[model samples]
Target: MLKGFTPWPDELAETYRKNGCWAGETFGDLLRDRAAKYGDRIAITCGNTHWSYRELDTRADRLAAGFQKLGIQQKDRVVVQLPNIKEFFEVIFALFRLGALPVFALPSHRSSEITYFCEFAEAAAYIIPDAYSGFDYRSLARQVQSKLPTLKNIIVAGEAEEFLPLEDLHTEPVKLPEVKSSDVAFLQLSGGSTGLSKLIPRTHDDYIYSLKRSVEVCWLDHSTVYLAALPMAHNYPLSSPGVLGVLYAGGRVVLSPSPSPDDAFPLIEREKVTITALVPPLAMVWMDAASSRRDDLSSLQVLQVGGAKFSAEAARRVKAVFGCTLQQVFGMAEGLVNYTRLDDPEEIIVNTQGKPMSPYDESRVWDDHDRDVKPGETGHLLTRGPYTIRGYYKAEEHNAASFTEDGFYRTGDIVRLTRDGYIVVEGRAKDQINRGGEKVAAEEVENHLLAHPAVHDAAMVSMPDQFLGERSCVFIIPRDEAPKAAELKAFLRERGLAAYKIPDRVEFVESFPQTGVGKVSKKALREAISEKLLAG
Candidate 1:
């Protein structure tokens, strides 16, 4: 068992288990049951291949047996980095079945992030696809092996030369695993704005409940045909009635490598995909593409947009342009996923980020002094509940700053609480642009810029300056062509923003640099912009 994770109080935990919220079954047990029930039902579609639930279960068992033969023990950590593929699910269940914790890594992470996850988790193995997006993972594996002596195995999903081929892991079948469901099932990386990622430990019991609640809320079942376009390991796509929820409901999944409308529309039309999710920027592109050829997107019934404060203006256009209902999702990987319900009023779906669904999701909006903020006032979001974790995995020092004394994890998000219990996210507390002591909220500026006709995507970040201590800059990805800086400044001024709040610098880019899971990496943007300024 991982010793550092903070567990829910014993009294509440026993109550939950007694009431059946904690299903008391491991991921392996759930998968096995689904396979027995669904049998030949199509569980996954990847590339040109279809995987049935029985095949998924059998593959996972064989892989688990192979891993145990290679000496992967119970509770060992393994970092898994694979593209959105059926094998991703196969590998995860195998690890869960063996009582090994698979550390979820995005396909885009390189030496720094990958090596850190291995070293920090003291990982026993590292797994990756042979190559993706023209980037060779074999080369990355070699570089990682040099720094990761604790990593005893390097398994690649596709063809391998010197490294072990994951195909070789299926020689023998394993017995049903005896691992406890209460143990930490996996490690998911936090969406870090500070630097390298933090690992979040999720137990089988809590995570499964999250999926079950999501199934009821989102109305997922065997009829649900979901398109998995976002990174498969991300919390929004992995759970929150994501792939796991779909699996629990005995539905089908179509793995999409890219979220572009050109890539996704074809899959949707072919598979009759009823629902899919994307970040706000990708949703903007899909809407534009669908507007031109509406017939191609007729199969998509709901589009879930999230992973930052999505502009309300863009949310309203999802149904108008794509002819699908817009469901707003607000969540972080650490915990606490919020979503707009299917039957919610259009105003709630578009304006608010929806109320937290769990009866035990204890959230409080507090000011800087840790006092509760008035309803509708901007404040920090803190939460700990049946699903939300109390602390990060093995991060003792960080736990002090990130969690309150009473166990509420400081979410670092700035939001407003409605009297009706809904939340309207402003942005993160650390994500602001502090210009000469005048704090400027980044999302506030970005929302104003997103309403502009030429702006396709917008992000505001801080840059160092000698005189003002810090200056604000905005990076815009133009829908067609970027407007002049003076024109945008005048646009902000017209929107009633103060002069200091208006960005002092504007840079146009064909596309913004993305974080591991497709969100705009403002930290990377700030560093690159600062470097460019230094060169000039």
Candidate 2:
């Protein structure tokens, strides 16, 4: 057993209990509490529309009543495939009132993701936006519906003939159900880099606990204004600093329709966003343009980044340019989260994933034998906490391998824990490529490639080699046109990357395959490469 694992501090625990933050209360209760305290205050603003907490609560009540009339009940799974629209929140809160679980699916995810998730979650109903500006979501939803037998109802956000309009559900008002904290509320899908994405069962207690802990640790105040730039369906953005954190702190949330720097910067400037969360790639764009754009990002106080490693160079550039406190958030949908706090040093913020919010969470780096590694040594990460789930939803085989004897989830991440307890992620353990005697991490090489000005997207995979067992093949998408392999190699050499880390073969492509959730589909890439080799 790992010793010295931290538990939630007494101060935080007392605050939660005193505030009546427990699982038995419906999410509707939380919205009601906020409405009572900040009724007139703007709770959410998107484009020209603004909603107060009271208005939002009333809307949620109406929708919940509508869902009940549609025969949706507690424990029933409802697929939510909507964008960052106001109706998404209304549907989510209303489902909480009815004790229905909302399985959040990204609107961009089409056949592969939509079908897989709907079947895996056992979804009985689905909600989709009528017509998103950039994408044809209605057409995609219809395609998914054809293949999904379990999906009985489809609610379209905009007016439609085949699907029921979202407005119809809100026609009749109904009272909210009495919800308990222990109720298994929903299924959140994991980013399935390993194989099949697992469904994570989230109980109201654990879900709210993690969010409240994040709010306390991040030092969010009632005055803080958060900019929601990332997709709301993502667990890290949704649960942590997304809706729950804002509601808990009595802060306002401003939504950005899209994540492009151009689209989001105006909102940050107008709303005077004090705190925000961003992925590493998006942060790079902001850092690059901050000097040229006179947007007054000065109101930005805390910029927390995660989803991928925040390059040290990127972090330094962001702090120098944006002049904001840069923090790193490392979390998984299955639960355990770590964040760089306000007290941490700048170097720690740039390099480490920081410590868990609660002392109750146990984090450790273990070798192949499951023995703890020395400080600063790379090993697989394992963690357990009150907020972490013991098993994935309906994943018996994976659960057997994912948990330790005592129940810590095997994180499948290669990381080094510093003597001071800060965790630095090296890469995914499964993504480590073996090339003869040398080992290469695909992310390490990909990061070096991304630093190149012309490269827009990159993925490194192990290609077959007769002599070396395996060799590195890099697939790159250029910002303008295609660049030669020699140019990329010289770029890597200039950055001090090792010869082994350099790609032996390069493929220039217009686009890479994507997962249902819009992430680069490396599995499809690997399969494509294997087929080419077989054909040759």
Candidate 3:
């Protein structure tokens, strides 16, 4: 067992195994089994590149052998920050075969996020593209490598610069270590309410169970052609019947370099992409763009929207505009995926975020006093199931606050349960903003602002927006001199924060309103900004 990971209770584990929820299947075996079954069927497509199941399996094997030869061992954590490409699958599958955990990071992550992930996870290696989306990650890798001695390797998918080129890592296939189903397969990133993202340790047994449930709920099959319009690293597009689920069903996955209409629409037309996912903002963008284009989007069977709340007005437009069923997904990387069934009534589909995917999943809506609320009342969502993690990796202090003593995860979502067991997501209980599906922890950005010389104190809050459901606003109490808003933005950029995490609005405040406990009252600050925007 991996140290610092919280395992399911022995009795519960036995029950899950006896009930056949965990089939003892590893990711390494998943690809090998699919290769044997599918043979020459194309597994993945990225632009001009296409890999059959057999070919992908072989590439993974060879890469695994090479990685082992290069000194990466079982249980080693590797920080992976690659774009949506064929290399993403090859590298991850190879790590699975070698029994190394791939710590997934979004391509948008810069020095701040990446460095923290590596240092926190005690990463053995870092993977990247030489350059992606006009940003050179090689420079970023150099900066990260210089800081952490545990990061032994810097492997680049494109030009290596001074680091190791990915192509050089591929060698003759050799026998690899046996990876167990219960072993931590990978570390997924959490949409945290803290200073940085918490690493979510998902074992093969639990994650494969999630994939099985997702594939069944989404009705994925061999004929399904999945279009990955969102980042493959994200849990929604990765396995909410995303790429991994499609692969499990022996289906083909088409990778879109970007989710923009120009990039995604052409791929959908050319590949006859049947299903794809988007957040609310991008869904609106696609709808507006689709009005002008006469492309053949008839092949799209399902347009699932999640990551943030998809308004009812926009949800109504999806089916009418694209001639496809709109499935609302409400899930976090930690676990517990909820999906609106395809056959559900239009009103249910538009208003609710569906129910838990697994029948074995447990959910409770609790009031502030720790008592369960009535079905119709909105409250905090607490869940535990076959797939939902017991706790985050190595975070005992945070985990105590985040999980219940009985092992239920505090989901931090404020939601009301329908009579028929559907969920109407009201809002979040944590200090986190769901900005167009990208989770921006207010405290994380506030910590960066607090580092500024001009900043005496900082408090971050969410303000409403039409496109992005919530945008961040920071109120700053200056020390000696008040800094200009532009200067603070530039300072955050210089500090290597992801562009999305930067505050959308900055305000100069003499002092912050205090709560009864003497803490900064973010509630009052949130209202202040909302009123300001309304007045404007």
Candidate 4:
């Protein structure tokens, strides 16, 4: 067992396996089995490149040999940060075959986030693209590699100026080490937190079980074509019947460079995409583009919206505009996934976030005192199940606060449950803003702002937005010489903060409203910004 990870109780583990929830399938063997079953069928397509199951499997096998030759053995940690390219799948599958855990990192992550991930995971290598979205990731890799002792190699998917080229890493296929399905597969990122993302360790048995349930719930089969529009590293797109589930069902996956209608609509028409997933903002964008854009989207059967709550008004437009059923998904990286069933009534599909995927998924709504709330009342959601993690990686102190004594994870979501068990997301209890489905932690951004010389103190709070649902507004108590808002934003960008995390609005404040015990009241700050937006 990995040192810092909390495992399920022995009795519960036995029950889970005995009940057949865990089938003991490691990813190393998953692709190989799929290749044997679905040989010569196109497994994935990105831009002009199309790879069949046999090719993908063969490439992974050869790449695994190369990685092993490069000293990446079982249990080795490698940080993989790449865009929606074919190499992303190739690199991850290769690492999986070598029994090395891939620490998934989003393309939007800059030096700060990347460095923290590599250092915290004690990564042996960092994989990246030369350039993506017009930004040079190699520069970011250079910055991170110099700082971390554990990061031995920097592998680039494109041109390798000073680092190792990924193309050169492919070697002759060789027998690889056996990997246990119970071993931790990968470290996924948690969105709700006060600091940098805490790693969520997922085992192959639990994650594969979730994917199987998703494949059933989404009605995925070999003929299904899944369009991956969102970041594949995100839990929503990776395994919420996303790419991995589609692959599990032997369905073809089409990669979209971006989630824009311009990028995805063409792929939908060309590849005959049957399903796709998007955030609320992207969903609205596609709906608005459907009228003006002359793309044949008749093949699209299901449009799944998740990451944040989709408004009822906008949710209703999905079927009318795109001619597909709207499946509202509500889930977190730590586990518990909920999806509106395909055959459900339209009213339930538009209004609620659906129910748990597994029958054994247990949930409880609790008040501030940890007492259970009524069935239909709103409260903090706590859950424990076969798929949900018992604790986060290496976070003993945080795990105590985040998880209950009995192992139920505190989901930090303020939600209401219907009498029929459907979830209606009310809001969030954590101090993080769900900015267009991209979670921005308050303390993480505040700490970056406080680094500026002109900033004495800073408070990050959520302000209402019509489009993104919520946008970050940072209220700064400046020093003797106050910095301009633009200057502060630029400074944060210079500090390697992701563009989405930069404050949408900045306000100069004299001081913050304090609680009864003199702690900063973020609620007061939020209300002040809300009133200001309304009045202005």
Candidate 5:
């Protein structure tokens, strides 16, 4: 059992005490309400097309009717695999209106995610985009369809044979069911790379509560225009500071076709985007190029970043170039999210994961013995909240290890809590490697390697050793030519990294495998290393 968790704040506790809102009010309600309130105001914009709140709402209604025609009833699972496109939002709202659960599948995932999610959630339908830049999504869908027997319908956004066209489906008349608050809206997967992904069932009430709280923290308004750069299939984009967040504030969303700096910047400039959410790598590229090319980023008001840690130096460089408020959103799909508020200081935005939103959300740091750590001491982070998941879907064994006896979810993230209630991530508990008696965090080494000018990307893993039990091996993709092992080791020594943390071996690669949502795939890297070891 974990001990000594802190109490929730007075304001947040008071808000939950008044819990009158139903859990069944889907994001569709927010969209329809916005349409009634804002009317002809633009709700979404793509390359040359603009959709008003009314138009978007009507389209969603038609799409919901189409799903109903296809026999998609309340709680039916609809898996969505799409990029940041306008149609993605349409499908999201459509599913919500019909009281169907939409599982978000990242577009970058080929067959791995599709097969896994479909089997786990018992998905009834799938929505995918047509070929975007020759990715051949139609072919991918066909490949997965053979394996997924539960999948009853395949809706493709663009023009494609065999795929039910989204436009044609919307011609039907509209009728939506009244869904209750406690209904499970969707399945949000854990961000694990290798093992079976845990499914979190998000109830409509707590899900909406999280979105509303995120909008309040960001101080979003009706005039705000968000650049949808991250994949909408992701929970970070699907909930917090995503579509629902934008809709609740009666703001506009500009969907970027892709996340490449070249593809996204032009859309941002054209649409005069006021706000956007980004990962660390994207931010680095934008900051590195925007100064040289004067890309009309003057409209950018808030630039929120998450998914991984960003260095203070990198954060400062971004602020200097973009001149936008840099907010950090540290959250997991399982539900504990900490956001740097509008009035938070620059250091807090750069260093800490901010504070919890409500009193119902309790956070604590626990040592190896599961005892509470003193403030400023490093420990595994644990959380309990109304929005947080109690257990994973059908994962009885994993659930036993993932949560505390009383109900708190063990985040698997190593962190330290400040006296001021801020949380600073140290590293992942699972990513820790033991070399003889010395323990090393892969993130710490990777962060150091990223600071080097020649290194563009890096991943560190434990390699078997005769004497050391296990040794650290670093794989790097360089901006220029690959650096020699001795050269990189010297650089690490010069930077004051302890000799023990220095890589015993180094390998060069042109590109590393990536997960569905764009994170580096360490699982693939580890397997590659194992194969190389066997070959030698």
Candidate 6:
């Protein structure tokens, strides 16, 4: 177990184990079991490479030995960032077999976010691609290595001339079960409004249970072919019956290099994809693209959308346009996944985010004063259960507010419970924006704004948008002269920030209004942007 993590209280752990939710199996164990059951079946298809279940097992076995030779020890932390590729699974299972903990990082994250994850986790190695979507990740990895002395190894996925090639990990197969299943399997980054992203520690017992439950509920089987169009590391695509669930059922997973409909549509048709998942932004784009495309999507049976809220109008279009059952997923990496079932009524599937996957999951709706809200009324969502995390990894100070005394993790979502107990997400309680389903933590963007020497004080706020649901705008109190919108956006872009994180609207103000607590009035800032847009 990781020392700083807050595990489930003894009584709860014992109860869950007794209920058989915690299978106590390492991911390596699960994969080995699957390979034995389904050896010659294709497990994954990424780009042009295909890996059968037997081949997947052998690759990880050999990689584990090579990683051990390179001095990776049990319990060593490694930060991993790779696009949707077959190598991602190979690396992840390799780390699992070696008892090394992998800290998953998004490919969109650059030096600013990656350095923070590496330094905070005290990671021993950072794995990345040489180039992804035309961006040079090797340079970013080197820069992170220079800043963080603890990061001794820089592993590259493709054409590694100066760094260790991830493929070089092929060596003599090593014995499996290097670590206990109770140990921390990996660290997942939490999206938050805090100064930096927080880490979520997922243990094998809890995560494997969640994956198994997802597979059961989603009705995945060997005949099912899943299209992994989203970032494979994302909790929604990775474990909400995502790639892992597909693999467990001996189904095939096709990894899309690009998230665009152009790249994914062809793969869906060619692979005979039965299921796929996407965020709201991508879902809408797919709906519009489907109207004009020549691709045959008859094989696609279900489309699962989650991560952030999807509009009711778009949800209705999901079934009509794609000709598939639309399963609305509302989940967090912290745990507690909700899904609209296949047999559910159309209204339930379209309007509600569904009910908790586990009957044991304890979900509460609370008003601002910590009192339970009236039936069907909106309130903040707090949850606890077999899979829901007790607390973030090593974040004691933040944990005090993020979790309840008895247990429940305080999910920063404003939601309303339906009569049947389904959750309809109303809004966010956190100081963040859901821009087309991709979250932009306000403080993260503010930090980048402050990086410009000319900026004195900065505040980022969300403004309603017709297409994206919501887009971010930043207010600046200039130090000297006010910078133009394009100039400020360019500044953030040059720093390798993701395109979506760059502010859609930039306004310069002489001073910012404050709340009674003396903190910047983000609400007032949002209204200010709305008014400015209205007047224009």
Output the number of the TM-score-best candidate: 1
Best by lDDT: 3
What lDDT is reached at residue 83 by model 3? Answer: 88
Question: What lDDT is obtained when candidate 5 is compared to the true structure?
Answer: 0.77
Per-residue CA lDDT of model 5 for 292-399, tens digit only, reads 676778888888777766655466565778888888777889888888777878877877767786556788799989899887898899998767877777677887
| Per-residue C-alpha lDDT of model 4 across residues 1-536, encoded as one tens digit per residue | 88688999899899999999989889877998999999999999998889999999988888888889988988888999988888888888899877799998888777888899988898998999999879999888878867765577889999989999999899999988888999998898887534378999999999999999999999999999999999888899999988999999999999998887889999999999999998754665577689778889999999999886676756877888998899999988899999999999999998899999999899999997998997788788999999999999888898999999999999988888889888988656755688998867665677667557776567789999999999999998876677899999888888898999999999998778642112356778889999999996
Ranking by lDDT: 3, 4, 1, 6, 2, 5
Give lDDT tens digits, candidate 6, residues 1-536.
67778888999999998999998788989999999989989999977779999999989889899888898878888999999988899899999998899998988787888899888888888898889889999889878878876678888889886999988879988665557778889998775444377889999889999888898889999998999888888778899988998887788899998778999999988899999998764665577689878789889999988776665656777788988999988888899899888888898898888888888888889998888899898788999998889889888888999999989899988887898878988656755688998867665566566667677667788998999999998998786788888988998899898888888888898877642112355677888898888986
Whole-model Cα lDDT per candidate? Answer: 0.86, 0.78, 0.87, 0.86, 0.77, 0.84
Which ten-residue region of model 5 has the weakest summed lDDT? 1-10
Model 6 TM-score (2 dp): 0.82
Q: Candidate 1: worst 10 consecutive residues by lDDT?
A: 288-297
* Superposition error at 221 for model 6 (Å): 0.8
- RMSD values for the candidates in order, in angstroms, are 1.7, 4.7, 10.8, 10.7, 4.2, 10.5
RMSD of 4: 10.7
Error of 5 at 522 (Å): 2.2
Error of 3 at 387 (Å): 0.3
Clashing pairs in 5: 23-181, 24-180, 24-181
lDDT digits (tens) for residues 86-205 of candidate 1:
889989999998999999998888998899999989888899988888999989988888877567699988987788889898758856457998999999989968666889999999
Which candidate would rank higher by TM-score, 4 or 5?
5
TM-score for candidate 3: 0.83
lDDT of candidate 2 over 440-519, digit per residue (tens): 88878887787787886678887778899887788897877888899999999988999889988888887787543334
- Higher-scoring candidate on lDDT, 1 or 2: 1
Cα error, residue 353 of model 3, in Å, equals 0.4
Q: Which stretches of candidate 3 lie over 4 Å from their true place?
A: 431-536
